[PDB]
Amino acid sequence: KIKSFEVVFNDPEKVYGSGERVAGRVIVEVSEVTRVKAVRILASGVAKVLWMQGSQQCAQTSEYLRYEDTLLLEDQPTGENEMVIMRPGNKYEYKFGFELPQGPLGTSFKGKYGSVDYWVKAFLDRPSQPTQETKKNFEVVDLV
């Protein structure tokens, strides 16, 4: 496991609405010289609700956001299995950005049970190591 691997949003205490851009960096630091195969991103948003209508139990589960990407450093290059070399004393910043869908995100769900769970996970792939993951939640609001 490397020195530091973090999702960092450009505005850390933001609540993002429907249709809005969520942007930040995945920041990587190492303590020894290390080759990196890829940094990948999964942003996920799932909402669930359960409610009663008279005797009828109702439930809904929506995966409203699924964004997957491979991020790039602006500087170090690519090509068939070209890998970035990371060295101690540097912060490697991988920019990301995606838009939330228009429409509901789950925050208006009404009933006896409601949840919305939105986050970004980043994945660091390295030769001869298992993938390392980091995960950071973010907050959303329906704008409809």
Three-state DSSP at 23 gives strand
Stated length of the chain: 144
Amino acid at 82: E
Tokens, residue 1: 């496991």
Instruction: Give the CATH number of the domain where residue 80 resides.
Output: 2.60.40.640
Q: Which helix (H) or strand (E) holds 94?
A: strand 92-99
Q: What is the resolution of this structure in A?
A: 1.5
How were these coordinates obtained? Answer: X-ray
Tokens 């208006």 -> residue:
108
Provide the number of structural domains found in the chain: 1
Using alpha carbons only, what angle is made at residue 46 by residues 55 and 64, rounded to the nearest 5 degrees? Answer: 105
Backbone angles phi, psi at 87, to 5 degrees: -130, 155
Q: CA-to-CA distance for 50 and 91, rounded, in angstroms?
A: 44
Domain that holds residue 79: 1-144
Cβ neighbours of 17 (radius 10 Å): 15
Report whether 135 contacts 6 (CB < 8 A): no
Residue type, 114: G
